[PDB]
């Protein structure tokens, strides 16, 4: 929970800089995994989302919402 | 492109960050204005005495 935070203020930091489009290439590029696994635990794929509904960014999240949609 | 001004001691410079066109981090002289709204830094404000 810590950690939680930690990550949440460096993206509330780093966003707040490339302001969330720039960001959206630098991830699209990023193949970020541990954060964001497309291949498996839908449940984890709540935990993710949501997680970035709760730091409010989320709007990086949409592609793992469709997935989210997809595997039901 | 610059804006100038003075107030109190200080003499501030703004650049908007679209024609900066050449972006770096600085030291601590330099203010980031926020827009209300969206929040980004669009421009770095400059000091002086």
């Given at each position: 929970?810590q950690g939680r935070?930690?990550?949440?203020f460096l993206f509330?930091?780093?966003?707040?800089?490339?302001?969330?489009?720039?960001?959206?290439?630098?991830?699209?590029?990023?193949?970020?995994?541990?954060?964001?696994?497309?291949?498996?635990?839908?449940?984890?794929?709540?935990?993710?989302?949501?997680?970035?509904?709760?730091?409010?960014?989320?709007?990086?999240?949409?592609?793992?919402?469709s997935r989210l949609?997809?595997?039901? | 492109?610059?804006?100038?001004?003075?107030?109190?001691?200080?003499?501030?410079?703004?650049?908007?960050?679209?024609?900066?066109?050449?972006?770096?981090?600085?030291?601590?002289?330099?203010?980031?204005?926020?827009?209300?709204?969206?929040?980004?830094?669009?421009?770095?404000?400059?000091?002086?005495?």
């Open positions: 929970p935070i930690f990550i949440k509330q930091e780093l966003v707040n800089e490339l302001g969330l489009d720039e960001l959206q290439l630098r991830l699209n590029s990023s193949k970020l995994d541990g954060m964001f696994p497309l291949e498996g635990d839908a449940e984890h794929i709540r935990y993710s989302i949501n997680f970035f509904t709760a730091i409010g960014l989320g709007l990086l999240t949409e592609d793992m919402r949609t997809i595997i039901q | 492109p610059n804006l100038l001004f003075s107030m109190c001691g200080f003499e501030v410079r703004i650049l908007p960050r679209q024609r900066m066109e050449e972006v770096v981090s600085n030291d601590e002289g330099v203010w980031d204005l926020v827009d209300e709204r969206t929040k980004q830094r669009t421009a770095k404000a400059y000091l002086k005495v």
